[PDB]
Amino acid sequence: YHSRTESSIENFLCRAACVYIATYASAGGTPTERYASWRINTRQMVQLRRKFELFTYLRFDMEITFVITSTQDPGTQLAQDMPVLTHQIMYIPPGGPVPNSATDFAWQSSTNPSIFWTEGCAPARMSVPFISIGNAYSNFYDGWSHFTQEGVYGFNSLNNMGHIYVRHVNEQSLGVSTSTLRVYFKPKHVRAWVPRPPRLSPYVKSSNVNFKPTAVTTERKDINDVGTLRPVGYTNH
Amino acid sequence: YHSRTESSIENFLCRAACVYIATYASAGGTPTERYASWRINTRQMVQLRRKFELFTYLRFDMEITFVITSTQDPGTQLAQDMPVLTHQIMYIPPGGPVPNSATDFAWQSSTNPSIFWTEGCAPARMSVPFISIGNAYSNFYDGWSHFTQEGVYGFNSLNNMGHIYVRHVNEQSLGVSTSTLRVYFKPKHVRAWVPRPPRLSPYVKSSNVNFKPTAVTTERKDINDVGTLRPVGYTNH
Amino acid sequence: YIEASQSPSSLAVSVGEKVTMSCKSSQSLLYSSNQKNYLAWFQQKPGQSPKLLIYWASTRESGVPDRFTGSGSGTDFTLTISSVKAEDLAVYYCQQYYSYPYTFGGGTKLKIKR
Amino acid sequence: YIEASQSPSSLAVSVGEKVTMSCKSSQSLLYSSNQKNYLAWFQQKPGQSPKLLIYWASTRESGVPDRFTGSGSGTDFTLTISSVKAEDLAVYYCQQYYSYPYTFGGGTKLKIKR
Amino acid sequence: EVQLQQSGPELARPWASVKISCQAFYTFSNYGMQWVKQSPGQGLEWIGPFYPGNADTSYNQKFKGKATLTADKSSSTAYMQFSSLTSEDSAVYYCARVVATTDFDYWGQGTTVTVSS
Amino acid sequence: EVQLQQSGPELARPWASVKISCQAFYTFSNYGMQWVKQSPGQGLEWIGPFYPGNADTSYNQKFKGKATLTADKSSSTAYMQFSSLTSEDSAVYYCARVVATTDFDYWGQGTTVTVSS
Amino acid sequence: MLTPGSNQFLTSDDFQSPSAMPQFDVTPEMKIPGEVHNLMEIAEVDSVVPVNNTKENINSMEAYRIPVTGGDQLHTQVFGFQMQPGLNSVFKRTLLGEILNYYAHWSGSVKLTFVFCGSAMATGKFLLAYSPPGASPPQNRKQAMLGTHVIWDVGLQSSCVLCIPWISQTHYRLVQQDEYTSAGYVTCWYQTGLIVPPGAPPSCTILCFASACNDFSVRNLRDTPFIEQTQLLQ
Amino acid sequence: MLTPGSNQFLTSDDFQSPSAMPQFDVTPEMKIPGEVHNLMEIAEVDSVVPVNNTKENINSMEAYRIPVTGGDQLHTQVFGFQMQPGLNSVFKRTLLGEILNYYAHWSGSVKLTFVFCGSAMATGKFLLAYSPPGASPPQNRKQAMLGTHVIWDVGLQSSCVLCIPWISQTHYRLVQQDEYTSAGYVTCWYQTGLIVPPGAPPSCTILCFASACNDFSVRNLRDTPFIEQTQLLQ
Amino acid sequence: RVRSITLGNSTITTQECANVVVGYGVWPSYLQDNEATAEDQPTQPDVATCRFYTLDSIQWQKESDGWWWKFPEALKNMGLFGQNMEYHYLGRSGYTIHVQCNASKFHQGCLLVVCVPEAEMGCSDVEREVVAASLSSEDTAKSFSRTESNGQHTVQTVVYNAGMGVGVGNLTIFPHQWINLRTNNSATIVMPYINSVPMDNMFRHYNFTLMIIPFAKLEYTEQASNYVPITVTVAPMCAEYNGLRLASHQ
Amino acid sequence: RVRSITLGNSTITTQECANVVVGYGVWPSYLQDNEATAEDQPTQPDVATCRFYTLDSIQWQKESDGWWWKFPEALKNMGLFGQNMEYHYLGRSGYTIHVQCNASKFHQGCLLVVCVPEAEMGCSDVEREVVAASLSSEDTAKSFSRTESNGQHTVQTVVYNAGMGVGVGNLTIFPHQWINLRTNNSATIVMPYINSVPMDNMFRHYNFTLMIIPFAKLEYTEQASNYVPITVTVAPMCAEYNGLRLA
């Protein structure tokens, strides 16, 4: 009697996976270097993508944990008295305002939930519920966005998970301060429908299912081939 | 689980055996060549002796059968018309008159039972009861007949049964008719006591138990030797 | 010991007839490990040296004609002569070379009957 | 079956020169657990009984000169003699003892160049 | 360096069964002995191994149904029995023997079985 | 077809030793020779061989403690020593020799050793 | 009251996180057919086994078909392989093999179904043989007959089912293990030969399906070895 | 009415004969102890077996004694013989042997008893082994151990019993016909050896008895071969 | 033995009693008020959508590779269904699919019939995209190929990858059946409505793909019919469409 | 355990445990009225006839062969039994024989003791016969011989033919007992009256013979007794004699 409790959907898909690693400075520089942005999608981490693409429809809540590690950056006019750093983490729902640079107005919108995190404490966590117009997420979509056979093929507008933005609240007068963000994504209360056969050919694109024709398995020397064998001895003789 | 009915005493000591063969003439020759005499004793047929001497005491009747075959001897003045031959068979109990020749008076006694047999019919048969003073015949007797420890050793005991005498009745003027007598002796209702080990050395005397020192059994090649032979090859024989 | 008995008497037949005779042994004469029968068929000219005819009881001696053929397995060992002759007057021995004692048979003389 | 092919031709070099030879095999003979190669370097003296030089293709037999060395693993099996001689003429074989049959080598007679 | 002997060469005849014995001077615990065929045209060819202490007798598939093997441990001998012999079987048979599952360190002497049809 | 000869017939006497030689015309490798007793009433009886190449000398058990054997392979001469010579030991001694392991292929000539007391 | 290790981020912990979008009434769910409660419901469906992947058919469907031919040969093998799912090159790409390859320990038995793709007028026999883990594969028909075997008749029946048992010392065996000559062997031998009437094609084909039985289970999830990319796509 | 075969003399028939001497009153029977009713009671008693007969002991009482040498006898054989009663040289003189030799067919079990005539301070072990008719005798202690055997410890028990079974295809086996490799063998082997204290003798003796068991029977009486004479004595 | 099915009173089919694979375990059924977010009552056209639509017969030859149809576009011109796919906006239906092969007792073959839900297919040229013409024809059956295609805007028609990017041998996880000409010549599949929304537009979204793939090649003796005819039949069930009436009082 | 037996109030015997073999199964018994038809009635004088007569002791050595007595002649000149033997013409009696060895735990050997009824013996010279002197001494034990005997009127004394002509290994058919110095120490044999007539003369007739044959030789170390004593004790029972008074 062997238990079957580790192979359930929950115990299979509820593993935290580092899905995004980014870096962003604090002091003056090119504006696009002063904030970190990530669009939520389970289609760029190939291992997690192959785990997810084993089913057709999925329904889950999202738990996101952010790990931030910052150090001073070498240069002239260094600081000796930097009190403490504070980071702002922003979740933008689909259709909400999206900042185009640091020190923008969109960082003050009351509709986008924010977390103000000061270094030294435990990593910041949030949990997004199942937000969608439809009734489930679809890994595969065979159709078009518009009903007149025009638009991107295989793109469903219903599923969208938003964006995540990170910036330095501190306006640091002297010294550049580089920070590193690692995102940990994990579904909870996972429901899966319509199992599908797992993929065979390597992924080439993050938006299509395009592929190259690969072989079905690894070659063998002959049809009636069982290698290793046994040398003559106490048993084989 | 097999029956034991052919190893019993009755089925072991009741087989007819030819214990005496004699020849006697009819007209010519010395008187001692005109009759056949035999003293009944189980001490001259070595097979019957060895089977009887397996026990010590025996008690049995006697059934005796006589087979007589006669011819006409070669010569001159030979007979041509002799009708038939009639023989006389005479049983002499112990302590009875015994003829010393043919035509003797003793052949006409009224105490000796006689059988007159004409040739051509079935053989003459007779049966004698247990004639003894004691209560059983003794094969082995350790002692002497006389109380003064002198006499003959193991001899002249009560084991006396009688004599048998056969003669011709027809007086023959022409020719001589030679005849042959075969005696067949069997016990009936035999009872045996005190079993003894079977003999090992061959018999040497018809009255004693004397013997030569004989080896206990036949030779053998080795003490730890069974059949499995060795053939002599490139090995040490 | 290990011995064998020769045929009870001689051939005592007229010349020119194929003869089949036998030699009985007093113990087994087959080495089942080698499937070998340790016995041979002998012959001794009166006044001269002996010489065998069939050795191993299955193959005739080289230089001996085909008429003498020995056969047999186990204790029994037989022989057949396709044509008896008056110029083979000798004694036939059925000897076993198993081991010493290398005892012989009894002998089979070819007497006169003609 | 499991056979092997010796060098295409004999040494055909002068006396006193080192010789490097190969005996390719139709099947690999390296076993993971034993970490040993089941092939032996043989040497058959002309007219006498054979005798190998190296067994396991890495352990020189007690009684083998330092000149002969076996090498090679798997399908490849090579031989190296630091000095060829004239009086040790033989026919070098490579006999495997991996599995039935115990197939021998290809044959290599030491020819004459002098 | 322990020696080894066998029956020896005889001049046989066609269809004459020839057993070639082999003496012993060793121990009989998971050790073995077999033979070879030294023919200049046929190179080196084994025929069938016996395994004393193991009771395993096999043959080359080129002679199955032709040759058999027998042995005696107490007598310390091994025998190849032949059947339906041909005239081209004449070869120098060496009694190969080894105290090992995998080695050939003791070799035979030689045996000639040339025939004359 | 090779013959075989030996010492020769001497008319001996009881209690007079008779050493019977025997030459050879073959080799001395694992081959052997023995003798037989040619007597009309006693048939044929072996007496005792010795085996060159084996160092095995054996005698008949009826003659155990009576006869011995001694010979030299380089001498190529085979004695047959005998003791306690009686009057009934008369026989025509054949020197049989065999190159097979166990056979009786080749035979001698014959010697008369009849004695008179 | 508190250890310094009480405040940490452990990647394998399950503590409820505060909600970021409350008062958001989620869309009610609907009954979509085809729900999955366990991945073991995926590993018990028959999939075609490429038994004929002889280095020239892996670029075609020819690998999926085992070819049986009619002729005078009688004692020749049909096919043969080793029964170690998840590592054997035959099974490692089917559904059973891949669901095994996600995990590290497994235990159970495997069902194999053979189907005869041939004419309706063909008639023959086969001698499907199985060898225990501690043995060598049979070499000829006689040795395979004396072991554990089954005579499949393609006349009375069109399909044959064979259930490999579960033999091991420990509780869970490994997926990748130094498993030499100690796992098992399944072979097929010609018994009589393929017979056809005048008009039926001589040759035929055999297909094989492999699935897991009801005792089957796995443990110790890990990463699959088939993925070979470490860069985020695009 | 009468065939010519009605008047004949058949020497194996029972017919009442005319009484020669009637009016004769026989002597009354008396009670003589030790009456025999059947000959099997003669066989059932125990008799000594001359095991050690080697052409020099049959003319002495050394024939019965089985030597057991003391010292470091590694694994030698104490004795060994073949169980065909009535024909084997050792069994053809005892009481059972003679009774069997009188008849022609026999069927039953033979009981062997070994007694150890030795010192009271001698200790050791012996291995008594039995090999059925269809097998070769063991040649060393190991093969004797692998078969049917009893370990007789002279220290604990001074007597051993072996009851040979009855194995044959037919009901009765002929008394006198040679069956090699079809008789059965008994062999004794040194297990440890005889260990003695200072003062006891270092050698001993073993005696053997052989007797028929309860289930024994004979058939077809005939004449014995041992007796030879054909002339009437004197 | 034989039986008749007179759906729509205008179509009759004869089949023998055999086995049916009923989708994922659920029979097609009407959408209830619980599942509908829209309160508007859906109208149910059942007069002519519940009949047998026999498509064209296809020829299975010795060198064929496979075929796919895309549903629900395969019935674009078939009867009232074709009119109602155009005159409405939201639709929903299930299907019954019969596949039959007309072969004698001397042929050989083994088809696999599958119904793949939302079979997203990839382009031949890796970087570019596909067009709507390549994916499906209105009623003609597109086919795979044995070798790799090298088109610009065409689907990858390699049979041993099914175009879907997955090994073909693993396709048996989907609703499927096997046609073995030795014993069987008919497969019946009942496919319910599988989608993430209660109602979807007919023209925009291909609900699923019916694929027939021969795993064992056809074989026949020289003097026999060169091909095997395959016939496909489709019957819609439980068709529900949007409403076109003023819910608010007028 | 140890027990003492006092028969006739004039004898003592000490013995612990002895297995008893009672003849052929019948105990000695007085003659009953069924088989008595002689001139006069029997008499039963048992005053001093029932007591233990201790015969002389014999020395079992390394090179001894056997010993053998003839009863009732072995008690010809011993007490009231000898007196009644001389006086009365007829007789009848049974016997009880105790044989006891005196050996330590460092001696080894084995003995067979048999009672042979009517052991008719053979002469050394086959043609001639035996004499009463050789057939039995007064009460001493005649001994067998390892080799042949060369006398003229002397019994054959080879031990492996028992002096009777039968194998010595087949003497176990008679009443017998085995004495093994390893385990056993004493033998007791009760012999009833075995004869073909109810009464017979004691002087001329030798009812039976007592034989003691060592199958296993006596072996000992240098430092021990170079002999083992053997002692024989008899005790007649149910002794009858003819009446000597007028009817």
Side-chain angles (χ1 to χ4, degrees), chain B residues 87-146:
Chain B
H87 320 273
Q88 162 157 44
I89 313 157
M90 183 177 176
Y91 179 65
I92 302 179
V98 170
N100 264 7
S101 288
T103 62
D104 187 294
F105 159 74
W107 289 95
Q108 283 134 30
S109 184
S110 178
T111 67
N112 298 293
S114 307
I115 312 192
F116 294 81
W117 186 66
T118 185
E119 183 178 1
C121 295
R125 304 271 281 270
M126 65 179 288
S127 66
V128 179
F130 175 70
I131 188 167
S132 179
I133 302 171
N135 306 359
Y137 302 125
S138 70
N139 298 317
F140 303 85
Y141 178 85
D142 197 10
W144 293 274
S145 67
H146 292 357

Side-chain angles (χ1 to χ4, degrees), chain I residues 89-233:
Chain I
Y89 185 41
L90 298 185
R92 158 198 184 93
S93 295
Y95 299 90
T96 297
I97 299 166
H98 302 257
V99 176
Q100 318 180 43
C101 299
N102 298 130
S104 68
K105 294 302 201 93
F106 287 69
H107 287 87
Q108 293 173 353
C110 202
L111 302 182
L112 163 68
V113 181
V114 294
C115 297
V116 186
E118 300 185 80
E120 189 169 353
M121 293 180 183
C123 200
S124 293
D125 202 355
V126 193
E127 301 300 327
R128 306 218 196 99
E129 215 174 5
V130 304
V131 306
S134 298
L135 296 176
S136 68
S137 181
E138 65 183 1
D139 53 358
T140 305
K142 310 290 306 310
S143 45
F144 299 108
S145 301
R146 186 172 299 114
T147 196
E148 162 188 350
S149 68
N150 63 356
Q152 311 182 317
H153 279 312
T154 61
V155 185
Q156 190 62 262
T157 61
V158 179
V159 61
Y160 65 74
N161 267 344
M164 272 174 43
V166 67
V168 58
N170 299 323
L171 273 185
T172 81
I173 177 64
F174 293 126
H176 75 304
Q177 205 167 349
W178 286 87
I179 296 284
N180 196 350
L181 289 189
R182 178 185 185 95
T183 181
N184 212 15
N185 64 7
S186 68
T188 301
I189 319 181
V190 189
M191 181 75 168
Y193 184 69
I194 291 156
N195 200 356
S196 46
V197 292
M199 280 188 192
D200 219 323
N201 177 234
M202 284 294 181
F203 273 80
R204 185 177 65 247
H205 190 85
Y206 307 138
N207 290 318
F208 65 91
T209 297
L210 182 63
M211 313 208 277
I212 293 187
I213 305 185
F215 271 88
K217 61 182 320 192
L218 177 52
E219 279 279 351
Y220 48 74
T221 317
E222 307 148 2
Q223 190 175 2
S225 286
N226 297 47
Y227 61 93
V228 165
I230 311 182
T231 318
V232 187
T233 312

Side-chain angles (χ1 to χ4, degrees), chain G residues 56-137:
Chain G
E56 312 155 330
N57 309 122
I58 62 170
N59 313 305
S60 176
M61 290 217 279
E62 268 287 338
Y64 281 120
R65 319 161 184 171
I66 310 168
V68 60
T69 179
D72 58 347
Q73 70 275 17
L74 196 149
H75 298 273
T76 306
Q77 201 170 354
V78 171
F79 73 88
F81 56 80
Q82 213 163 41
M83 208 45 187
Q84 42 182 19
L87 176 82
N88 197 1
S89 67
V90 177
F91 293 87
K92 65 182 180 181
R93 197 64 61 169
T94 69
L95 288 161
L96 179 69
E98 291 203 283
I99 306 302
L100 287 201
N101 269 334
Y102 269 85
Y103 294 89
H105 307 146
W106 77 272
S107 78
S109 73
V110 185
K111 209 168 78 83
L112 303 177
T113 297
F114 296 92
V115 177
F116 184 78
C117 305
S119 191
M121 302 283 279
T123 296
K125 273 181 174 61
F126 293 99
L127 196 67
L128 292 160
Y130 166 61
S131 72
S136 298

Side-chain angles (χ1 to χ4, degrees), chain F residues 27-108:
Chain F
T27 59
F28 294 85
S29 66
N30 193 69
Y31 313 142
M33 61 305 288
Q34 56 265 10
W35 301 74
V36 302
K37 170 182 186 61
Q38 175 51 69
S39 197
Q42 288 99 49
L44 272 299
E45 317 273 26
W46 79 289
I47 181 162
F50 65 92
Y51 275 123
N54 315 88
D56 289 290
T57 299
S58 66
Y59 311 121
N60 195 9
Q61 289 180 355
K62 266 70 165 154
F63 296 89
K64 217 78 171 179
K66 191 173 186 178
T68 54
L69 279 157
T70 318
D72 186 303
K73 278 167 279 146
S74 63
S75 177
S76 305
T77 286
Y79 309 146
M80 192 305 297
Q81 288 295 350
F82 193 72
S83 296
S84 296
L85 305 99
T86 79
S87 279
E88 283 281 18
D89 77 320
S90 296
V92 174
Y93 277 74
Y94 293 117
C95 192
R97 192 178 189 275
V98 182
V99 298
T101 174
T102 65
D103 215 2
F104 271 102
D105 288 335
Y106 319 110
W107 293 85

Side-chain angles (χ1 to χ4, degrees), chain H residues 29-34 42 45-48 58-61 64-65 93-95 115-122 154-155 158 197-205 207 209, chain J residues 24 26 35 65 92 105-110 146 148 159-160 167-170 172-173 176 178 180-183 192-198 213-217 219-221:
Chain H
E29 283 176 320
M30 73 166 319
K31 212 169 309 303
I32 297 170
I42 299 197
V45 309
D46 278 24
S47 59
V48 192
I58 45 168
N59 286 266
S60 177
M61 281 195 328
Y64 305 100
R65 312 167 194 177
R93 282 304 184 180
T94 63
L95 296 177
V115 66
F116 181 69
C117 311
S119 171
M121 312 286 268
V154 299
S158 181
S203 45
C204 295
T205 290
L207 296 183
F209 312 119
Chain J
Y24 294 99
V26 65
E35 298 88 18
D65 286 29
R92 184 161 141 140
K105 280 171 52 197
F106 288 71
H107 293 82
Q108 73 183 42
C110 185
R146 194 191 310 310
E148 292 78 29
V159 63
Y160 61 89
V168 68
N170 317 328
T172 64
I173 193 66
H176 70 272
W178 292 94
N180 190 350
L181 298 191
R182 171 206 191 77
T183 176
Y193 182 67
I194 295 156
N195 198 355
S196 43
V197 291
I213 298 191
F215 277 99
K217 63 202 299 301
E219 216 174 330
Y220 47 85
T221 316

